[PDB]
PDB file of C-alpha atoms and ligand atoms in Angstrom:
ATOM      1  CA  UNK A   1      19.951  -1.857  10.657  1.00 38.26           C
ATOM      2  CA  UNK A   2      18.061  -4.449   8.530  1.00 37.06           C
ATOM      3  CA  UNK A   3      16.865  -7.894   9.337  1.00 38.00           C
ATOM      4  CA  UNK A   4      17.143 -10.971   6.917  1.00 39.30           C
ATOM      5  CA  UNK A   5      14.555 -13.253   7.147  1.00 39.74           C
ATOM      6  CA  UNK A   6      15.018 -16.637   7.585  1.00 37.32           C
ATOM      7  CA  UNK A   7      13.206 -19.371   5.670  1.00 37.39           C
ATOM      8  CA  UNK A   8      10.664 -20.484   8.082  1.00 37.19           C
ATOM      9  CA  UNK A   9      10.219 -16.889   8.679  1.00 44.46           C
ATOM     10  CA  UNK A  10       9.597 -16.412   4.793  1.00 44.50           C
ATOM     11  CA  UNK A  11       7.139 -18.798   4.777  1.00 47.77           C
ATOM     12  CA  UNK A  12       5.141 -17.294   7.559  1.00 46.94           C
ATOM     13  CA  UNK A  13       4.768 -14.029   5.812  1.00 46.46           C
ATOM     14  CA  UNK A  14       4.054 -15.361   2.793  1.00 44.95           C
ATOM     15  CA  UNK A  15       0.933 -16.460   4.746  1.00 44.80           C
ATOM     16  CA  UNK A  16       0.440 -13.329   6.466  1.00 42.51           C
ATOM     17  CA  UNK A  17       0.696 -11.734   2.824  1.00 41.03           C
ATOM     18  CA  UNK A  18      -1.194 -13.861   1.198  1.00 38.01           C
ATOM     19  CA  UNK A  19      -4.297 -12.985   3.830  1.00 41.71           C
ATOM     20  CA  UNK A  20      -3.594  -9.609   3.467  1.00 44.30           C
ATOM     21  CA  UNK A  21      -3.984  -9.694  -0.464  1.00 46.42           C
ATOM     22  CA  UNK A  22      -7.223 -11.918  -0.155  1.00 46.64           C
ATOM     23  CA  UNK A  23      -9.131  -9.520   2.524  1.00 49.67           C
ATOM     24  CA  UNK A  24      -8.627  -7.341  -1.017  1.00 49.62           C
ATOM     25  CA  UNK A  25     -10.054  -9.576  -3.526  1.00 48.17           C
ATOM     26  CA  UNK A  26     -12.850 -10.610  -1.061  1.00 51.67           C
ATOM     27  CA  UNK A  27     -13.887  -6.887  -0.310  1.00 52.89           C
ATOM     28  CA  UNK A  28     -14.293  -5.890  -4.009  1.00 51.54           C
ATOM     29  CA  UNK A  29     -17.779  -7.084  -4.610  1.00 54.07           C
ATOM     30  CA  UNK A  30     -19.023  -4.724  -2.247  1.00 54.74           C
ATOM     31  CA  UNK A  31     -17.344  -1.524  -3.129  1.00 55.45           C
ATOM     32  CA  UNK A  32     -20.131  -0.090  -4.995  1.00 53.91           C
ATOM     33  CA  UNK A  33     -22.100   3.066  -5.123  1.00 53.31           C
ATOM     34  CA  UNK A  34     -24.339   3.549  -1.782  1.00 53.36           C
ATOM     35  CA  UNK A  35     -21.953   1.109   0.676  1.00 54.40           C
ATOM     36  CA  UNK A  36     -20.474   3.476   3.711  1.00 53.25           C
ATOM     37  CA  UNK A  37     -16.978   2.623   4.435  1.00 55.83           C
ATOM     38  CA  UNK A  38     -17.958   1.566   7.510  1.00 57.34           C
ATOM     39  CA  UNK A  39     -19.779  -0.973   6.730  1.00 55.51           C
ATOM     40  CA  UNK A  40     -16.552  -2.151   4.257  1.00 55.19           C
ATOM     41  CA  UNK A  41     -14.375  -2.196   7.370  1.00 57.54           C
ATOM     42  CA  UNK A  42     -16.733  -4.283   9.617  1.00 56.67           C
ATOM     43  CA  UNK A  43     -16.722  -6.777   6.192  1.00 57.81           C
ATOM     44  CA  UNK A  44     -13.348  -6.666   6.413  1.00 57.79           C
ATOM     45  CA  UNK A  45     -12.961  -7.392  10.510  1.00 58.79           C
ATOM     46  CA  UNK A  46     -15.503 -10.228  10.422  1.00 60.02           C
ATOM     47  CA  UNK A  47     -13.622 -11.850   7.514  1.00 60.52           C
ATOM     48  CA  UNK A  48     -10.103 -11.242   9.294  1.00 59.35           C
ATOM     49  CA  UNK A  49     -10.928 -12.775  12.588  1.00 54.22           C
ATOM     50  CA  UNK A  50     -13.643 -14.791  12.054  1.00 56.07           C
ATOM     51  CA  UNK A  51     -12.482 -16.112   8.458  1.00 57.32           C
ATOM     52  CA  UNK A  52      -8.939 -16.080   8.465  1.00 59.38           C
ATOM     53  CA  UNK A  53      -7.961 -16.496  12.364  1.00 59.37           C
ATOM     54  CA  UNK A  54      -5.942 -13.566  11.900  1.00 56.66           C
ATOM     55  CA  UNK A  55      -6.419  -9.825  13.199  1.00 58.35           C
ATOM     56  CA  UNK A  56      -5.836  -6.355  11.733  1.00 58.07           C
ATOM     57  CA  UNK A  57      -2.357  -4.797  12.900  1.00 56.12           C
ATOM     58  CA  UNK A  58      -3.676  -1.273  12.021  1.00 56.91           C
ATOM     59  CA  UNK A  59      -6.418  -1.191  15.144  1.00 58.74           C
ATOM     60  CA  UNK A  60      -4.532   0.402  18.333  1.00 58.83           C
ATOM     61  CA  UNK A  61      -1.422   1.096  16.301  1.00 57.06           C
ATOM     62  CA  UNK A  62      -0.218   4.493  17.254  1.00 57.40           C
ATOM     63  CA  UNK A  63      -3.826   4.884  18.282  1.00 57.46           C
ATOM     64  CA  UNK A  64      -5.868   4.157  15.080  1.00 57.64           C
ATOM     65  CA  UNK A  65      -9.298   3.140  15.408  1.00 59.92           C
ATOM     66  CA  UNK A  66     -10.057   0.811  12.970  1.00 60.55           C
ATOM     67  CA  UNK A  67      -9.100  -2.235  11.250  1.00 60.96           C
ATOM     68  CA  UNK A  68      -8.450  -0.833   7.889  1.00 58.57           C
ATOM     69  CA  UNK A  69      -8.252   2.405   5.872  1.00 59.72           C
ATOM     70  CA  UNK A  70      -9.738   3.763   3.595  1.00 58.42           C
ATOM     71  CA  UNK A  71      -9.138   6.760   1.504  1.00 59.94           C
ATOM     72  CA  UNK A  72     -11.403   8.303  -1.563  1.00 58.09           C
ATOM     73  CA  UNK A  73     -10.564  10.927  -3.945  1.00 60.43           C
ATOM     74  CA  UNK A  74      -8.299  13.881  -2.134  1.00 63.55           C
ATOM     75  CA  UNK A  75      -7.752  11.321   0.816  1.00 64.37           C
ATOM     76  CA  UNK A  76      -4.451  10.585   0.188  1.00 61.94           C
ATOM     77  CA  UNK A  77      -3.857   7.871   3.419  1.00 60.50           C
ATOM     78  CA  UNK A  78      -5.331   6.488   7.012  1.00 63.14           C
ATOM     79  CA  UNK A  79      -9.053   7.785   5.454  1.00 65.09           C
ATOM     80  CA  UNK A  80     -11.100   6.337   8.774  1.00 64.77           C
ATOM     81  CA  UNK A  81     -13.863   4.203   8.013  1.00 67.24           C
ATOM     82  CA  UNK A  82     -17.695   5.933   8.907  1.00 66.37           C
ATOM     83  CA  UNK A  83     -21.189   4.812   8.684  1.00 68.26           C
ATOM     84  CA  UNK A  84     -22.199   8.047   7.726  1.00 68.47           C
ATOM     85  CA  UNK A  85     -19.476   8.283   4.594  1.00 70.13           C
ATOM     86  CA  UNK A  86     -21.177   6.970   1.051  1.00 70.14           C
ATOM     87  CA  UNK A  87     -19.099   5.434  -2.078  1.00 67.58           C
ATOM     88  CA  UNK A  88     -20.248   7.511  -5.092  1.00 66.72           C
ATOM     89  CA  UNK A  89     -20.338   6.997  -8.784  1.00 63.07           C
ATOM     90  CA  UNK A  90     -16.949   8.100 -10.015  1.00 67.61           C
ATOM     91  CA  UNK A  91     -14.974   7.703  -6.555  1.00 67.65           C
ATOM     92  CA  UNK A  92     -11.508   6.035  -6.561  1.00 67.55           C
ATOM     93  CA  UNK A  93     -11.060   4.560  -2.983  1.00 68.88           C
ATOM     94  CA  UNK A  94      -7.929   3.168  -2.001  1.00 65.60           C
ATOM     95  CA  UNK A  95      -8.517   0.209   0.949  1.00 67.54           C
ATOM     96  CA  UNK A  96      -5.426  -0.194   3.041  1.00 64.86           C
ATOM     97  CA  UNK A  97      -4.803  -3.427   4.791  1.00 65.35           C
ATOM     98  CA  UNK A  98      -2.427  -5.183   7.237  1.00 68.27           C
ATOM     99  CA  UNK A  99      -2.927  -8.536   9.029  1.00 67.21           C
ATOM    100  CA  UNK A 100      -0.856 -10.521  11.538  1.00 67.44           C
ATOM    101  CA  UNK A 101      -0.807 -14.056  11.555  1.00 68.36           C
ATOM    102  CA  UNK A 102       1.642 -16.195  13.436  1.00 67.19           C
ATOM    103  CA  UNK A 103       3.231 -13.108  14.267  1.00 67.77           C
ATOM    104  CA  UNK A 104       4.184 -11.596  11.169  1.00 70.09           C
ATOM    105  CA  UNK A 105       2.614  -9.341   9.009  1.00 73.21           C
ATOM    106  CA  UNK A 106       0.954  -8.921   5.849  1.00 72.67           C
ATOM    107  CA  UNK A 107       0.975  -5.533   4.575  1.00 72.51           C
ATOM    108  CA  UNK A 108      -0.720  -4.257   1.156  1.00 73.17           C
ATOM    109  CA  UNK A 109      -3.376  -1.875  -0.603  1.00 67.76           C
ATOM    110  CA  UNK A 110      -4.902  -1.202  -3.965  1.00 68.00           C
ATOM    111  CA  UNK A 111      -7.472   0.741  -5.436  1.00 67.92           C
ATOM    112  CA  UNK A 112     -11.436   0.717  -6.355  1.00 68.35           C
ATOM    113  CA  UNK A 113     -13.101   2.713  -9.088  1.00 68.70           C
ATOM    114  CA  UNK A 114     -16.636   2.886  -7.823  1.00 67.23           C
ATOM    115  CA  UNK A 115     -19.486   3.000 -10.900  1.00 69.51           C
ATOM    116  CA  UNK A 116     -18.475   4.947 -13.822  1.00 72.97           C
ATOM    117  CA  UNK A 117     -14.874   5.670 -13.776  1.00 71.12           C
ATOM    118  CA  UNK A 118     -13.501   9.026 -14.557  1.00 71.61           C
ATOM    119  CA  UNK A 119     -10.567   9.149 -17.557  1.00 77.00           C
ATOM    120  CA  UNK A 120      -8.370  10.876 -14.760  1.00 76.95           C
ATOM    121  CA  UNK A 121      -9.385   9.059 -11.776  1.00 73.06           C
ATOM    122  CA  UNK A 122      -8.563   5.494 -13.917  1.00 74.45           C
ATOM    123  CA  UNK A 123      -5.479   7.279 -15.305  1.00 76.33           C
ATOM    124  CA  UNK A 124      -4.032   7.991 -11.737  1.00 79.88           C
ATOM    125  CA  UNK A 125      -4.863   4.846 -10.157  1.00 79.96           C
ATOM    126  CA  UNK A 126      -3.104   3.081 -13.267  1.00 81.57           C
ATOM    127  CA  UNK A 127      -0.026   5.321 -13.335  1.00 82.10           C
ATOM    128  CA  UNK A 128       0.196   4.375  -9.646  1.00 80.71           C
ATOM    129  CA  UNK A 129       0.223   1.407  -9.814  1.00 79.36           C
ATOM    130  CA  UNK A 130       2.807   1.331 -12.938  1.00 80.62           C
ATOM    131  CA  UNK A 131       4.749   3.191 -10.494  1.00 79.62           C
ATOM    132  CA  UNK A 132       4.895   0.283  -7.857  1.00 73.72           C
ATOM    133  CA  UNK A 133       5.110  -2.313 -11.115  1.00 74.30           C
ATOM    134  CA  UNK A 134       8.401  -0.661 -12.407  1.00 74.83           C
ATOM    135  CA  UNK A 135       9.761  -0.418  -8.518  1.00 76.91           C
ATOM    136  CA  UNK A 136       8.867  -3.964  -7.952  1.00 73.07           C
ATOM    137  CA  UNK A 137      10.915  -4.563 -11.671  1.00 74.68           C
ATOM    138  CA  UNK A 138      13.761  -3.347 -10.417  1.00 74.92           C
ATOM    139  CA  UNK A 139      14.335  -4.771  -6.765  1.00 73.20           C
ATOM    140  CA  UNK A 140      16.973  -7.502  -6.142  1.00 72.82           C
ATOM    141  CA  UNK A 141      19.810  -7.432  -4.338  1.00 75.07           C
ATOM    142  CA  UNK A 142      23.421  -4.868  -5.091  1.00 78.12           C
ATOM    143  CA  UNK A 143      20.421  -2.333  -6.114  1.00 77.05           C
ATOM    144  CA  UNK A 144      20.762   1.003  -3.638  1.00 77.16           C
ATOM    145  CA  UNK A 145      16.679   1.917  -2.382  1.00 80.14           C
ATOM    146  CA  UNK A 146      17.609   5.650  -3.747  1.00 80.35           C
ATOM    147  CA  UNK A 147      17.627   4.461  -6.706  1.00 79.63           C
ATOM    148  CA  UNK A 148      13.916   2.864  -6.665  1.00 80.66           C
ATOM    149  CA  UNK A 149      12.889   5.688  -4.962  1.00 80.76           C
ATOM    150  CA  UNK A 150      14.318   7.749  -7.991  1.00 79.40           C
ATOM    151  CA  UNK A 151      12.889   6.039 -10.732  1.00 79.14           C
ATOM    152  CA  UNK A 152       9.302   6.289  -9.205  1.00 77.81           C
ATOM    153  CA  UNK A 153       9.339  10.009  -9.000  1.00 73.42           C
ATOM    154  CA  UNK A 154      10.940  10.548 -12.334  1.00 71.88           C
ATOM    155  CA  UNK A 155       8.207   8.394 -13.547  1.00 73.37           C
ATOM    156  CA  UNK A 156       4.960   9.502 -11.470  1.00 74.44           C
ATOM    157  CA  UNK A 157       6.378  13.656 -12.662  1.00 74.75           C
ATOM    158  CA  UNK A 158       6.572  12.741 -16.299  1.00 74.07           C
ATOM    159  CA  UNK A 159       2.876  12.056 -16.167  1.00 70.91           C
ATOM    160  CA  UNK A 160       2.752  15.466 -14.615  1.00 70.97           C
ATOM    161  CA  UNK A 161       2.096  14.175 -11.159  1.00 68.31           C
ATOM    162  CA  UNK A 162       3.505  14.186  -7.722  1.00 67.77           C
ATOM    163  CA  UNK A 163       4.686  12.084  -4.785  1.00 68.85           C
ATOM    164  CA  UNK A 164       3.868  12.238  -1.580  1.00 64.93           C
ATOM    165  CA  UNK A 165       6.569  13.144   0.964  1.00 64.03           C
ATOM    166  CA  UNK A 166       5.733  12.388   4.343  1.00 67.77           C
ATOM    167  CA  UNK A 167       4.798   8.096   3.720  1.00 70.04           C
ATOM    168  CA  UNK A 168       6.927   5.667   2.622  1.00 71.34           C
ATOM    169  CA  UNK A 169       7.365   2.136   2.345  1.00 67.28           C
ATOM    170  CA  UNK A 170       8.564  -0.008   5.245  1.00 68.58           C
ATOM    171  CA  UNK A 171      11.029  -3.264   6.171  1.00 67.93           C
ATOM    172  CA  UNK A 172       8.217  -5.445   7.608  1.00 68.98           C
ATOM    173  CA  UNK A 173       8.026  -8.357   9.393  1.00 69.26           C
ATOM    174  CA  UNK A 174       7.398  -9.384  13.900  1.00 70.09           C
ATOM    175  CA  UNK A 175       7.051  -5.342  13.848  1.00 67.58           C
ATOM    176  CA  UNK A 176       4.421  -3.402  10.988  1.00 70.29           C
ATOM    177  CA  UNK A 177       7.207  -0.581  10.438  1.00 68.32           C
ATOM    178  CA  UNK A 178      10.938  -1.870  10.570  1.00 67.58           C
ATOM    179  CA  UNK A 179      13.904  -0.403   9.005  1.00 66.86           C
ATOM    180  CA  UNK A 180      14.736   0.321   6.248  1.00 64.67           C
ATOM    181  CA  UNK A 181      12.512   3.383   5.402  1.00 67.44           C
ATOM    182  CA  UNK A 182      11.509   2.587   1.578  1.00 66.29           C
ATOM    183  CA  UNK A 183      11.324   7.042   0.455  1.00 65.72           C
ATOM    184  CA  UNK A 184       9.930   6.691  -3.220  1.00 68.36           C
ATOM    185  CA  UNK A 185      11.196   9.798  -4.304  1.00 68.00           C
ATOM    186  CA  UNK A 186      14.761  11.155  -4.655  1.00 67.37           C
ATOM    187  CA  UNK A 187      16.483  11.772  -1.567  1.00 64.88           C
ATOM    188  CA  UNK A 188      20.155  12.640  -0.568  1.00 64.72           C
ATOM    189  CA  UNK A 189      20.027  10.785   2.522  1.00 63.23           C
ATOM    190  CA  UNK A 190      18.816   7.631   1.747  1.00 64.14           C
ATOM    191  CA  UNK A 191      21.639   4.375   1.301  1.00 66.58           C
ATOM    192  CA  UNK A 192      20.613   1.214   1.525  1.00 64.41           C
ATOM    193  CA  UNK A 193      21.582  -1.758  -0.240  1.00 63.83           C
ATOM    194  CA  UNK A 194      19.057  -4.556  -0.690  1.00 59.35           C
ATOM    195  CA  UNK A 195      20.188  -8.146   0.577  1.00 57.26           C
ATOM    196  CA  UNK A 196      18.463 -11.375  -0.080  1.00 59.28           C
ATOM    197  CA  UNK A 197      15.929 -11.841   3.002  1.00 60.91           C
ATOM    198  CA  UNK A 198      14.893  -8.630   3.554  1.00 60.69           C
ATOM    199  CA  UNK A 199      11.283  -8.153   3.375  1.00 57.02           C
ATOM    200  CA  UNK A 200       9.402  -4.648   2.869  1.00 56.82           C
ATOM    201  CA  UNK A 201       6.583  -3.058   1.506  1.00 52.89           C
ATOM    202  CA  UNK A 202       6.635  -0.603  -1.687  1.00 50.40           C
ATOM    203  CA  UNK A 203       3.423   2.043  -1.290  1.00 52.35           C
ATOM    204  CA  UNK A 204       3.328   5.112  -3.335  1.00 51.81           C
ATOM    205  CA  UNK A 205       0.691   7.995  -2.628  1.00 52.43           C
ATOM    206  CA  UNK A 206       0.169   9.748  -5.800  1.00 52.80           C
ATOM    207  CA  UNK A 207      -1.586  13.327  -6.227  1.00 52.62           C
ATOM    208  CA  UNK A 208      -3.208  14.421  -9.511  1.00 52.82           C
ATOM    209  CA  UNK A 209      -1.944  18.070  -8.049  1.00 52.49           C
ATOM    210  CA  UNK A 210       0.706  19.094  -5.897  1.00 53.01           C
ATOM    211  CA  UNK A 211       2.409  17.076  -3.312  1.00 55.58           C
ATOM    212  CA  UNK A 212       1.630  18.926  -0.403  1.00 56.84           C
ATOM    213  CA  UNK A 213      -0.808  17.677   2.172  1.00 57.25           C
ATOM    214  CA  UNK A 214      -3.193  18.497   4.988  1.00 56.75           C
ATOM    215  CA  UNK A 215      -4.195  16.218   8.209  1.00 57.46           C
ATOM    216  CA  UNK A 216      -7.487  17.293   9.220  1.00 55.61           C
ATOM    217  CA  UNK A 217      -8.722  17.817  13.037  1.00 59.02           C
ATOM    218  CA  UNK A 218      -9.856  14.222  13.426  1.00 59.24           C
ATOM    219  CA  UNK A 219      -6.015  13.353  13.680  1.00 59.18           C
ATOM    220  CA  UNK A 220      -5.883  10.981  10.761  1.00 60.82           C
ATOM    221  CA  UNK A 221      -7.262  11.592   7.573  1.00 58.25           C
ATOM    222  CA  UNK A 222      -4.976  13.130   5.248  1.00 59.56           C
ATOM    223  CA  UNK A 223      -5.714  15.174   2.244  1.00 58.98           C
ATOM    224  CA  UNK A 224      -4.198  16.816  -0.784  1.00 58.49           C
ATOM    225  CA  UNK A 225      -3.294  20.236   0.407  1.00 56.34           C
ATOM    226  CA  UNK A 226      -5.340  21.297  -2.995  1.00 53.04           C
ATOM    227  CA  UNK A 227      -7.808  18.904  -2.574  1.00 54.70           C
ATOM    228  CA  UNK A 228      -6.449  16.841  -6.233  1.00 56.21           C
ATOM    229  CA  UNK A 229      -7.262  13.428  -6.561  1.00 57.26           C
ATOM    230  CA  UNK A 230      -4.405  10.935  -4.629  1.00 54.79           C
ATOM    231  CA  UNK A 231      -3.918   7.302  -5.321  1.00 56.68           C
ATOM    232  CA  UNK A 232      -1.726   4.629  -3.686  1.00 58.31           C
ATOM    233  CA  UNK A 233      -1.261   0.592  -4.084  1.00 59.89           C
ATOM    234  CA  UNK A 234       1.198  -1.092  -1.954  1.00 63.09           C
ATOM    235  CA  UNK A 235       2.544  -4.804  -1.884  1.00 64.40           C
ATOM    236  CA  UNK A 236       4.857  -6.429   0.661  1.00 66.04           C
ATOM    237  CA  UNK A 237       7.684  -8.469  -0.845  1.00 67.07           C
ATOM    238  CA  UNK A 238      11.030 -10.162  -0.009  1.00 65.09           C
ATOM    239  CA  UNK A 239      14.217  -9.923  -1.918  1.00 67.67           C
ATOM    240  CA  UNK A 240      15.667 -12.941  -3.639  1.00 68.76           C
ATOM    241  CA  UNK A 241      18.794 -14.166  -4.783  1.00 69.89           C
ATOM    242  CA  UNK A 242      18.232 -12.411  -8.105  1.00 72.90           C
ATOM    243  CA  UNK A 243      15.414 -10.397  -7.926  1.00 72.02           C
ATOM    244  CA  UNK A 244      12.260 -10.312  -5.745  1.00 71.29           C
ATOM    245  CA  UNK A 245       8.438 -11.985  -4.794  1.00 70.53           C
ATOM    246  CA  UNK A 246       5.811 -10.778  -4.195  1.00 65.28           C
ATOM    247  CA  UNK A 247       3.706 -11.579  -0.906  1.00 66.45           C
ATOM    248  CA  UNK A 248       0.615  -9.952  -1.654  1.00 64.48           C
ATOM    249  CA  UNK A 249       0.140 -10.585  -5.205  1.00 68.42           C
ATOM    250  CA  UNK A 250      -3.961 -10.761  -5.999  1.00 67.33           C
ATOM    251  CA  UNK A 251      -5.644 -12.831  -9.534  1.00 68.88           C
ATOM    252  CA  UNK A 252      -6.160  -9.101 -10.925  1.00 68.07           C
ATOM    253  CA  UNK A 253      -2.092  -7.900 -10.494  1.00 68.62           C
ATOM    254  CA  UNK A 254      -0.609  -7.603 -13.960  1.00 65.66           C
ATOM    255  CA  UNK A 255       2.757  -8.592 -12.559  1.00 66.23           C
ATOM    256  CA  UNK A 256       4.085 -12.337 -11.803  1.00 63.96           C
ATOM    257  CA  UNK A 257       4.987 -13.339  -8.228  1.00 62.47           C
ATOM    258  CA  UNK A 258       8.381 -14.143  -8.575  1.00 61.67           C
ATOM    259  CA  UNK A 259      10.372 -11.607 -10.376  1.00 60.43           C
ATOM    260  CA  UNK A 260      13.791 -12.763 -11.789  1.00 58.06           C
ATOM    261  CA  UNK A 261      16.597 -11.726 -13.095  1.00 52.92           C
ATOM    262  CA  UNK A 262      19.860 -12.213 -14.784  1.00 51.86           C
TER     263      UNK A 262
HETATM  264  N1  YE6 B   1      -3.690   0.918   8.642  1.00 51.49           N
HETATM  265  N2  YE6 B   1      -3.141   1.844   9.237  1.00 51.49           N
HETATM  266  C1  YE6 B   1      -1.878   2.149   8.953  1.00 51.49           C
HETATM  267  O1  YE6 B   1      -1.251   1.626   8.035  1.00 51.49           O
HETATM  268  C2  YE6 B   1      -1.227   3.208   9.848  1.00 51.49           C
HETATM  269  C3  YE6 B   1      -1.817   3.861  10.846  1.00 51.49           C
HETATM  270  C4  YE6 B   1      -0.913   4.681  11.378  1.00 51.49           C
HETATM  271  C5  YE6 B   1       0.237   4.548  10.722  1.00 51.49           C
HETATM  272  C6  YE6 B   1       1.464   5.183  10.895  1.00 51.49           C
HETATM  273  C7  YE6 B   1       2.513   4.746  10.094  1.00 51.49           C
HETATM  274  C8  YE6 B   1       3.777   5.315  10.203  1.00 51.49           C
HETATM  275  C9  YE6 B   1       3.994   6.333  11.124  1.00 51.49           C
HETATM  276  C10 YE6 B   1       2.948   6.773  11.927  1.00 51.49           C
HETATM  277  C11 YE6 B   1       1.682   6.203  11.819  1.00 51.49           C
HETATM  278 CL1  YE6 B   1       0.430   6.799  12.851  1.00 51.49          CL
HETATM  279  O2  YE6 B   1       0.069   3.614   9.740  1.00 51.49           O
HETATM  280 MN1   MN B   2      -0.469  -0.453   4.246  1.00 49.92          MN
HETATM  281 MN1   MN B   3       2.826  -0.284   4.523  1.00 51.71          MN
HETATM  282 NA1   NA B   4      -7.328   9.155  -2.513  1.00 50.35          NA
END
């Protein structure tokens, strides 16, 4: 059950992608200490519809009210944006964004360090995103996703860390979540052998603590069952011939678009 892309298809999320990615690098300015997240997510709107003719996929989906998330410290996913909810000197706040243009999407998400970052807080957000790096490293096609999703736990535990269980990455394209589910952790059940075309998104949610969570009674926000510090970046890509490229890459990745192999 997975769908390969066609060029012209390719092409249109690269677009898609590529807005996601810049609603990122145009929001960062403004995550500082004393901006609500509110306020970021209206930014973020205006510059999505008004900017780049495009609209947020997350608003309405499954019932979410806004156009993007966004998660600090023990938030570990779908943190919902509030007037009344301040960015603090030490935060890490992970902004979670997804576009649709031409009808396909854009899917991807990184993380702020607001004011003085903490040694841990900087060590988790890097670590996380390592994790996604040395995923993205080793997608191309032949390559079995429980393997992926192996190598990112075994990595994210060594640094005496844990993964979240209930997200996971997504095949992506006319729908936000397609098959195949992208697990990054070990699991018996997953099988799924990457083909040239398919296009998905990579996200891991890493906790400080222990992996077990919490949803509290707002229906959305999700937090670290221990209330530890949880990071996540995510990028959408598509799988080449030999390897893989990235949709949503951003000036301040530390990883090349087109990953190759041989
Ligand atoms: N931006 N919002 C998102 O990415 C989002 C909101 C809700 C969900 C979701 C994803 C998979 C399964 C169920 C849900 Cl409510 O994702
Ligand atoms: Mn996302
Ligand atoms: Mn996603
Ligand atoms: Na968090």
């Amino acid at each position: 059950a997975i769908s390969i892309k066609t060029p012209e298809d390719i092409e249109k999320m690269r677009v898609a992608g590529r807005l996601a990615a810049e609603v990122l690098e145009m929001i960062e300015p403004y995550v500082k200490p004393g901006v609500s997240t509110g306020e970021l997510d209206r930014i973020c709107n205006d510059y999505i519809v008004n900017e780049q003719h495009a609209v947020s996929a997350c608003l309405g989906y499954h019932g979410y009210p806004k156009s993007v998330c966004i998660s600090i410290n023990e938030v570990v996913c779908h943190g919902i944006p509030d007037d009344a909810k301040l960015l603090k000197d030490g935060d890490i706040v992970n902004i979670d964004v997804t576009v649709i243009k031409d009808g396909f999407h854009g899917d991807t998400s990184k993380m702020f360090i607001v004011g003085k970052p903490t040694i841990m807080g900087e060590r988790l957000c890097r670590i996380t995103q390592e994790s996604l790096y040395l995923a993205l490293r080793m997608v191309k096609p032949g390559i079995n996703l429980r393997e992926i999703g192996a190598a990112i736990q075994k990595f994210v535990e060594a640094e005496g860390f844990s993964v979240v269980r209930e997200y996971c990455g997504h095949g992506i394209g006319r729908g936000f979540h397609e098959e195949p589910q992208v697990l990054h952790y070990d699991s018996r059940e997953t099988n799924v052998v990457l083909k040239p075309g398919m296009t998905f998104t990579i996200e891991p949610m890493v906790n400080a603590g222990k992996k077990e969570i919490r949803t509290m009674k707002d229906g959305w926000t999700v937090k670290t069952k221990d209330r530890s510090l949880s990071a996540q970046y995510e990028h959408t890509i598509v799988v080449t011939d030999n390897g893989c490229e990235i949709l949503t890459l951003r000036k301040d990745d530390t990883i090349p678009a087109i990953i190759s192999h041989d």
